[PDB]
Amino acid sequence: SADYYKGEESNSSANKCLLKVAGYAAQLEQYQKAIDIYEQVGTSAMDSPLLKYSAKDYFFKAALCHFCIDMLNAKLAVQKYEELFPAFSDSRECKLMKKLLEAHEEQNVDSYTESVKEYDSISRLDQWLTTMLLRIKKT
Amino acid sequence: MAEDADMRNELEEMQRRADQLADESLESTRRMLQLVEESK
């Protein structure tokens, strides 16, 4: 369906289908496709004034999806997102990822879970993000 | 000094009134922040 709509040049509809496919794929434990799709949608959405505000969210999700692969590439991707989309630095997402990475660097799982609980209290979390964070926490 | 004791206890009750008011203020501020974050 996304290919059919792309052939019709009807944008803003293939993007949602690709995002759904990427999320379900990430749930299926295939992250390269999810990372690529989320990055592509984010780079397609930065230039849009209306969607720009949501773009940060996409970036955040992508950065979380790359977290499982390895810590070093997670830090590198955080740097790349901060440098390419400087506005993203303002959001609390960067602070949250930095605190989580700091907690992992010293095996300080307690700080990790305290930060996760505080953020959840501020705003209730989604099933996908909860599962991703729990799977990461296993390490 | 029992009555004076209770007068002191009333003073501490006023202090705890101030404390309670501060607490419910703190809660109100938290609810502010939560709703303001939610609207986005």
Swiss-Prot record, chain A:
S-S bonds: none
Q: Which domain of life is it from?
A: Eukaryota
Kindly list the positions at which Phosphoserine occurs in this protein: S48
Q: Where in the cell is it found?
A: Cell membrane
Oligomer and partners: Interacts with PRKCABP, and disrupts the interaction between GRIA2 and PRKCABP, leading to the internalization of GRIA2. Found in a complex with VAMP8. Component of a SNARE-like complex that contains at least ZW10, USE1L, RINT1, STX18 and NAPA/SNAP-alpha. Interacts with VTI1A. Interacts with STX12. Interacts with GNA12 (via N-terminus); the interaction promotes CDH5 localization to plasma membrane.
| Protein function | Required for vesicular transport between the endoplasmic reticulum and the Golgi apparatus. Together with GNA12 promotes CDH5 localization to plasma membrane.
Q: Into which family does the record put it?
A: Belongs to the SNAP family.
Please identify the protein, giving its name as recorded: Alpha-soluble NSF attachment protein
UniProtKB/Swiss-Prot annotation, chain B:
Q: How is it modified after translation?
A: Palmitoylated. (Microbial infection) Targeted and hydrolyzed by C.botulinum neurotoxin type A (BoNT/A, botA) which hydrolyzes the 197-Gln-|-Arg-198 bond and inhibits neurotransmitter release.
Q: What is this protein called?
A: Synaptosomal-associated protein 25
Cellular location of this protein? Cytoplasm, Perinuclear region; Cell membrane; Synapse, Synaptosome; Photoreceptor inner segment
User: Quaternary state and partners of this protein?
Assistant: Part of the SNARE core complex containing SNAP25, VAMP2 and STX1A;this complex constitutes the basic catalytic machinery of the complex neurotransmitter release apparatus. Recruited to the SNARE complex following binding of the SNARE complex component STX1A to STXBP1. This complex binds CPLX1. Found in a complex containing SYT1, SV2B and syntaxin-1. Found in a ternary complex with STX1A and VAMP8. Interacts with HSC70 and with SYT9, forming a complex with DNAJC5. The interaction with SYT9 is inhibited in presence of calcium. Isoform 1 and isoform 2 interact with BLOC1S6. Interacts with CENPF.
* Role: t-SNARE involved in the molecular regulation of neurotransmitter release. May play an important role in the synaptic function of specific neuronal systems. Associates with proteins involved in vesicle docking and membrane fusion. Regulates plasma membrane recycling through its interaction with CENPF. Modulates the gating characteristics of the delayed rectifier voltage-dependent potassium channel KCNB1 in pancreatic beta cells.
**Positions of the region Disordered?**
1-23
Residue ranges annotated as compositionally biased, kind Basic and acidic residues, are: 1-20
What is the covered span of the full protein? 1 to 40 of 206
Similarity annotation:
Belongs to the SNAP-25 family.
Task: List S-S links within the chain.
Answer: none
